[PDB]
């Protein structure tokens, strides 16, 4: 077969990107947030009530016979017929454990039937509500992919990915969804991801120490690991650029001899 590498490079940032891309790598979990708490922060449905449906279950609806369409096993949320919801994250440029394009690549490499979108200060993944909650609790929130200080589950107003951290090391938030409790040293979500307040704040753990952030981050920085310290990634990027240029000029084996 083919044993897949996942990313070029020898630095810690490249290794962390490879770990995020690897579906067989078990992400280290750093907190325990109950499923109902994740649902409450998500703010789409009330925990304990049934999922709303967009269409009848796939068994009830009638489809034409399609051999190729029936080869793919559908998600359970699709099998029942649940509405497609989203979960959005903002990542700080100051050593956040996960970054937008890294998040999107890991999502499309690890999860089934997801819709990932990448912005400079935003990253959103859309899926059927039940499966979305499942992998939001299992992977997105409980593992090293999330830091309650440098990253934040937030829709609506996203801003602060490029700003400096506040006095507690937390990313700037214009809505203040999460606050720092100095008595216990934990971050508490006082609002859900869109901005409506929660009746009971939910403890999402304490901020990851900066020393661990330096080791688990996936961003290149002059103060941290710089791309100049990882010439292998730059060479691969330049190779991709040259291959694109040669293919767009004349796509033959002779023009690719100058690769």
């Amino acid at each position: 077969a083919y044993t897949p590498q996942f990313y070029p490079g020898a630095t810690k940032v490249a290794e962390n990107r490879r770990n995020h891309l690897n579906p067989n790598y078990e992400l280290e979990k750093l907190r325990e947030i109950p499923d109902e708490d994740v649902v409450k922060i998500m703010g789409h449905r009330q925990p304990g009530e049934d999922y709303k449906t967009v269409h009848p279950p796939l068994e009830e609806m009638d489809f034409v016979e399609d051999y190729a369409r029936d080869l793919v096993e559908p998600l359970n949320g699709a099998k029942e017929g649940h509405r497609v919801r989203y979960i959005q994250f903002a990542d700080s440029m100051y050593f956040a454990p996960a970054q937008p394009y890294d998040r999107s690549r890991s999502y499309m490499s690890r999860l089934r039937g997801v819709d990932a979108g990448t912005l400079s200060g935003r990253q959103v993944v859309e899926c059927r509500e039940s499966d979305l909650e499942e992998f939001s609790k299992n992977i997105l929130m409980d593992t090293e992919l999330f830091d309650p200080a440098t990253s934040g589950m937030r829709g609506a107003t996203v801003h602060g990915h490029s700003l400096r951290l506040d006095e507690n090391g937390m990313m700037f938030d214009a809505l203040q969804r999460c606050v720092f409790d100095e008595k216990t040293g934990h971050v508490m979500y006082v609002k859900d991801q869109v901005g409506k307040p929660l009746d009971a704040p939910v403890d999402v753990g304490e901020p990851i120490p900066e020393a661990k952030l330096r080791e688990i981050t996936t961003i290149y920085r002059n103060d941290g690991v710089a791309m100049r310290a990882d010439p292998d990634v730059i060479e691969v990027v330049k190779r991709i650029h040259r291959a694109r240029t040669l293919g767009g000029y004349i796509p033959t084996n002779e023009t690719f001899k100058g690769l």
């Binding site: 703010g43 789409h44 497609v84 919801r85 989203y86 819709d115 979108g117 959103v124 859309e126 829709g155 869109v194």
Partner: protein
């Protein structure tokens, strides 16, 4: 004999209007006109200060102007006189605002957006929510940015003419909505007209967005639709807070700003390459619906003549005058249709003849009625030109005579039959009868569409057939030549004024342009052009707050 144009001829000409002789070369040249002297002084000051000695205006070169008496111009149905220079579209702010108000208007229907919000997005839609959305769009349309101080915004005083209005055929929703930004059909139209317009519109809700004039000044006419759509989308996603995903937001965006958009004009192809909301894309029925005289007047001739004046001032003066030719322009071509009561007198005679012979709308459109009505009106108009030498001096160009007589004939035929194509056929017959009568017509080619018209009036071929309401400046015969389109719009309006119709082509445009918030009130275009010629018209789009005072 009593004629409607007699009083203007008495005021304009010192001799008797029936007198066949006068004297020339004794008026001092351009000094006989105050406007020319003001231009000379302004030119001297401007050259010396701003131009650093480069000459700008030199009356001494070219034709010696003012060899004859430069007549003043009345405005039909108005008791005020102005020089011909004040009626130039560049010197008249009223005409500029007339075009600005039409250019910056986009009508968007909000029923698919409401249905998508209710069902797909799971958000309730109530009259309170509609009022909140109207507040949001009114703040955001000119230059606003909602709850975002860090975002750059346009100076509010720079867009004081920008409004977002709403109207609906649903009575209960109409009275549940805020009257601050509602176009009330019931209180703006007569009872029968309001009922007809509500029946035609239905039980649907529409929003009218008036993009600020400055946006159309800096950019082109195709900017208006994009500006409206962007601001509508922003206001919709701000007022209504939706926790759905982003694909659903794309469906909502289509439903809200690309589903029921009504534009004033279409884009033009080939050598007239232009975007939408340009005067060459406005159909004659659309322009008839823009003018609101059916609201305040029951006289069919006046209703047709207001549309004639608006169409002249737009098509001949702005569109063909500058958009297509440029230069001094075609002011005296269009003013001949709305300055003195010559066209008013001819159209009133045509209406009287039709009422006496065929009744108000007492005949089906046949060839014989077209021929006899058009011939009678043309003969009357031509003999009126013959026996009043001052009238012939006033309309010195044959084009500013052929168009007036043919418009009278077409309006008469449209009164008699109620069919616009019959009216245009009468127009063409009048044109050829005029040519045979006076051994004369307009300019060179000028009658390209008048020799081609008779065959294309009732044609059924692909590029030749269209109802006169669906025709416009992009119609292949009407594409180039001046002196026709403004009268074609009036004939199209007269086709419906004979039936007492509340609208001609689009009820939504008729309701949208009844808005009291418009700078140019389309109820009396002639009066507003008169006001603009007197430098008493407050136009929009002026960058006074971003310019130095010195």
């Amino acid at each position: 004999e009593k004629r409607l144009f007699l009083k203007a001829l008495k005021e304009k000409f010192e001799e008797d209007p029936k007198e066949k002789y006068t004297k020339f070369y004794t008026f001092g040249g351009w000094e006989q006109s105050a406007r020319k002297r003001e231009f000379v002084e302004a030119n001297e000051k401007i050259v010396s200060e701003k131009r650093q000695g480069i000459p700008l205006y030199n009356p001494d070169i070219g034709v010696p102007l003012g060899q004859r008496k430069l007549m003043p111009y009345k405005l039909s149905n108005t008791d005020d006189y102005c020089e011909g220079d004040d009626l130039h579209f560049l010197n008249n702010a009223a005409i500029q605002q007339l075009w600005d108000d039409i250019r910056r208007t986009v009508i968007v229907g909000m029923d698919t957006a409401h249905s998508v919000l209710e069902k797909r997005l799971g958000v309730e839609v109530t009259p309170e929510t509609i009022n909140e959305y109207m507040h949001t769009i009114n703040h955001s349309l000119p230059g606003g940015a909602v709850v975002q101080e860090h975002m750059v915004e346009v100076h509010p005083s720079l867009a004081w003419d920008c409004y977002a209005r709403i109207f609906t055929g649903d009575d209960e929703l109409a009275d549940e909505l805020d009257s601050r930004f509602l176009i009330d059909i019931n209180k703006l139209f007569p009872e029968e007209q309001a009922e007809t317009l509500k029946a035609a519109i239905g039980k649907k809700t529409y929003q009218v967005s008036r993009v600020p004039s400055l946006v159309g000044r800096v950019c082109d006419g195709g900017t208006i639709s994009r500006w409206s759509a962007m601001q509508i989308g922003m206001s919709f996603i701000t007022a209504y807070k939706l926790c759905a995903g982003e694909a659903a937001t794309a469906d909502f965006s289509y439903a809200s700003k690309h589903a029921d958009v009504i534009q004033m004009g279409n884009a033009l192809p080939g050598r007239r390459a232009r975007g939408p909301n340009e005067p060459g894309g406005i159909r004659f029925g659309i322009l008839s619906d823009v003018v609101q005289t059916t609201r305040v007047s029951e006289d069919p001739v006046e209703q047709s003549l207001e549309v004639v004046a608006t169409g002249a001032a737009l098509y001949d003066q702005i569109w063909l005058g500058a958009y297509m030719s440029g230069g001094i322009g075609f002011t005296q071509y269009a003013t001949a249709s709305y300055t003195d009561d010559i066209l008013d007198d001819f159209s009133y005679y045509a209406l009287d003849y039709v009422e006496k012979k065929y009744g108000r709308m007492g005949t089906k459109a046949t060839m014989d009625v077209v021929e006899d009505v058009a011939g009678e009106v043309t003969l009357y108009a031509l003999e009126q030109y013959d026996d009043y030498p001052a009238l012939l001096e006033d309309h010195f160009g044959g084009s500013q005579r052929a168009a007036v007589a043919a418009a009278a004939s077409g309006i008469g035929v449209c009164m008699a039959t109620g069919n616009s194509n019959a009216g245009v056929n009468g127009w063409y017959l009048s044109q050829i009868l005029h040519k045979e009568y006076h051994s004369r017509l307009g300019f060179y080619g000028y009658d390209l569409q008048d020799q081609c018209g008779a065959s294309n009036s009732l044609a059924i071929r692909n590029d030749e057939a269209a109802p006169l309401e669906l025709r416009g400046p992009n119609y292949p015969n009407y594409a180039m030549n001046v002196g026709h389109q403004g009268e074609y719009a009036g004939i199209a309006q007269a086709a419906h004024s004979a039936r007492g119709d509340a609208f001609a082509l689009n009820p939504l445009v008729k309701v949208a342009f009844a808005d009291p918030m418009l700078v140019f009130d389309f109820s009396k275009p002639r009066k507003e052009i008169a006001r603009g010629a007197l430098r008493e018209f407050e136009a929009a789009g002026e960058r006074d707050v971003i310019l130095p005072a010195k």
